[model samples]
Target: NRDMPLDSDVFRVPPGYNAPQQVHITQGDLVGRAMIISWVTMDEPGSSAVRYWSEKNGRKRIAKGKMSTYRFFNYSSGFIHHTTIRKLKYNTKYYYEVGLRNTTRRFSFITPPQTGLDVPYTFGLIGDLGQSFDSNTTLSHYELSPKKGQTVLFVGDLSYADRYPNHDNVRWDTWGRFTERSVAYQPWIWTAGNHEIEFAPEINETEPFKPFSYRYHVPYEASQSTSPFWYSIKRASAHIIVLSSYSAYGRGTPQYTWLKKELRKVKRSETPWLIVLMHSPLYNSYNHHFMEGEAMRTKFEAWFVKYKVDVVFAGHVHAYERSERVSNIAYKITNGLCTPVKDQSAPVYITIGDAGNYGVIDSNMIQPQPEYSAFREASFGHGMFDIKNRTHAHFSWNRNQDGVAVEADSVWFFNRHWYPVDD
Candidate 1:
């Protein structure tokens, strides 16, 4: 449902579409029981409202919020709706209907378990998700994928539309609709990829990603940074960190410094699984971007090791590559090389950037595989992190091959080795 013309200026009302369409969810705060619901309408909304309630509880709770506006190259955008639903109960099933007039279909979601050492949940991971025909399968398979994921981790490169300095907002609208199919219900925690750095005509530069900035907002406020680019959210027994590869995260930059300080304050007894998500990968053997993310790895690897980050997820290169559990390595940013140390409490690095894109799947992998590379798949797919408990989690790759969610690869990780800071 929508109201504005897909091709008209912000002043015109689009025909045959009046309700909010690009509906999705984002992380609200670090703690559980809160969520940020976002959606896009063709034009301004009558009122941005979210009616939510649990299945067991018959009375519905109404929470009203604000509708943010933004600039699309030369024209002002129609309506970017957002609402925060807070003070919810954990591990409970909640249904919500957003928008007042032309209300969307009621969507349901399960709140993450309370923060503790005892909890389990399944979450999905995808990145470099550019809109395309195959991208439909990418969304459908995940929608019907086995062992339904309670939450989704989007590493970046959301809409390929930002690939250019000047692009069409219709493309963005399409991407938003494409993403809402799966993200409307599940909390799609995300970070910005290089692609999000759209050309800001207002600033007369191709830098700052204004579209991404206003479209979705994360829990950066809780992390003490107004910089929406990087932040972390903790729910259940897992703490998820999102970093910006495009921002200043080098040796002593603000982002890097914040990361260093945050890692030191982590309490293993509270959240056992420490997972990190970004747009670029630290370890990749592909011929495309082997040297792209070496800088980030060199800067953050050791600290992650010190804090015992259980897993790292990134998506930039349009292929799938998983690294063996190796840590305490020396990252040589000069040559984009990593030297793995024996039992260094290193994080298990995984690059599943092969989500759907206009370029399809990237198969141009470097011939001879590296030692640390455990597996490689030149296919379009997403990942799943099924946390079992304080000491274990199952991971799998769901490839889109015009068939069911074919498992191209699978593995399991035991936390006994990843966590060296157990207190």
Candidate 2:
């Protein structure tokens, strides 16, 4: 558990006894027409209801939802409510209230534009974000950026609650509140990370992802995925597929089969930007988790190439690295040469797990940086992917300088569909 001590503020509870704390929202369905509002109540299980309305239209609506609680080791969680508000308008701001009692909290979010190839959108990329001062710094930079309110492609290792001794579940609650400021305002597409695998034998807790599953509910059903560990959704001009790095992804496994089917179902004419997110990186330059995803990469890299995925984002390695357009499966790696295969069909792999957990794995890197790695840095930072149009999208990684954000690496990612022919 190479993580910093939990922030003291994590232990402080909200003022109201029945107040809805840790309120957050996520994309509710395959498109931007719906959103899932989730929150927790401390004292009692308040009505799992959400009242929402677009200020422009001023037509109010109420959505009833379900509530549940879970027990982990010695800790019992409060009533967690998840309500899905559907039929939302695209590119519209929807304000909503949680908690039926006097402890209600108000928050608002803007839905993305309609799913189309020509539509433009922005995505704030964050991964491996733990609750520390550095984590707060990274989050502050994101909140202050010009692209703050956009959807966040969160590539997992969130909370890092597993790093705590005795598995203090309260850290999860604190993490929820820490990110609630931004999370309650936009759709953060989630993917699971290894830290979420809280299978502790000493604590007599054997279930993996027990806490994560109970709290962060994704729209796996909307994507027709049998498991919540993996799912896909369409936002504006992007077809985003989230894969589980810890889940079995062999040739005939469920993830593999589902991914094949999902890729086949995507229409490049509609969603020009095909993006994939996972926890472990298929391509990495840092020594910490280097080649850890080799097994999964072996089984899925070819499909990613065949499907023409534009970009692949991953976490686990505690540094930021962006790989050039390349694939070992197509060109082959000999004697660790691992030269960058200048193929037009390969996805640009970016490892952005640098959002400050505790330490950075920058000291021990593979010497003489591989050709596939376009840029690598050990810093606390977040990334932004702004899809301007169907042809080009701007991607940048901003490293945290004390409390400020400095743009470190950036590039214009061309739509693979339009750049099929090699120059």
Candidate 3:
């Protein structure tokens, strides 16, 4: 009914052909000096390899990794590949390329600086992105922006692959071609959204969650998490945790256990700011999936309060909602900006999911001058986080409708004074 002939191009690629696609990078363990490179191919290419070298020098180094194949919808298959290069210099620029078997489809990526304790850092957060005009506009803006040493955090629903299963693989190829400039240069970290799950009733089977897990190499081991669905990392003085909204986030799950251990080790003196990311919103006022995340929050809120988490980032609400710090009792600050009531307080939650998700943001979701909610807006845009120092950071939401206009949501989350210690 929905233009089947037009969908024929989605799986037009020839069989047994090997092409490197969906290339991206992520931080590796080993203190702060290594990185993991990951990519995908249409067919099994016998070998997975990466050729890397510093931009300054012409010397070359090769790292090899294993490859695995998975079938989806009983119609298509994919080969996922990964490798890690170690003992590299810190805060240096490097170029690398990935190849399958004997092909020469190469790409390059930059490693983040090794300095810790609130180093200057920046990131671009986008969600519900697809291969369309709006997606292209967002990507172009990202490429032209002056923010350097920045990472791209995708909150899920990438490529909009579920709508056309037969053509989903080609859609991914088109997306890779469009995003090669940004993905090859910077690390593109992602989580799973509902759209990533494709089911095929015709074949009486469901597609395994292969696309995301195969494409990005995250620090699953370092974060003490088994799956890439949930993991954590340290950038400068920020302890960033990426959670899996798709997984079972109960009290005693592997994700919960790892999160508790990870948070318990956060030293305010070192990385004072604690930021967590998930695909679904825990406190969204929007009608779309409102309060759907409260179950997960109920299971995980106390740990965040105990650790003095500064901010929580989530998407999937298809709107924006920034809340004031939650506390057990009424709290007062110097200028009445939301501050912690007691020594141990909850993290401030912010939802910026309106990144051209093909759905309209509802204006009714705005709460009228509420105590816990600081600001709310329905606009198509992204968020930029500028980590200035250990105690001070700036977060601005850039709306596309406003033409580069940024709303300064909040400024300066003081980690030292804001955190309450039990002495």
Name the best candidate (by TM-score): 2
Cα lDDT tens digits, model 1, 297-416, are: 777887787777888999888888998767635545586555665443777889988877775667888778877788998888788888888887889898887455567788877774
Error of 3 at 292 (Å): 0.8
TM-score of 3: 0.84
TM values, all candidates: 0.89, 0.95, 0.84
Query: Per-model C-alpha lDDT, please?
Result: 0.77, 0.86, 0.67
> For residues 1-423, could you state the per-residue lDDT of candidate 3 as single tens digits?
222232343324323356676666767763456777766676555467788888777689988887866555543546777788887776778878776465556666666676577577887888776665555556665565555437877788776655665535555555554566677677766677776655555755454456545555677787678887788777666777888877777778888777878777776676767788888876676767877887777677667777777888888877777876775323233555443343336777788777765445556663454566767887767777777877677677776655554453544455533433321
* lDDT (10s digit) by residue, model 2, range 272-378: 99999999999998889778998988899889898889999998888889988887774445556444577789999999998987554454789899888888988
Query: Which regions of candidate 2 fall more than 4 Å away from where they truly are?
Result: 1-12, 330-340, 359-361, 402-405, 420-423
Worst 10 residues of 3 by lDDT: 2-11
